[PDB]
Amino acid sequence: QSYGFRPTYGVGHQPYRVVVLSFELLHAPATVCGPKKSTNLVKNKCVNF
């Protein structure tokens, strides 16, 4: 069935674009990280990772 989207209709019948972003948070090789910045790789010292 087709929609009757018209600007005359008020709230409840207007077209609303819905975007569903499905993510995968399990431990696996990821390539969609947030920008940020890469630092130096120190070793043999108690540091954050």
Binding site: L26, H27, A28, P29
Partner: peptide
Amino acid sequence: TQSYTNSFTRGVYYPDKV
């Protein structure tokens, strides 16, 4: 054409990536 065999210890795979 068709035969019936049995897998003894095969058919296992890695479930996760850990």
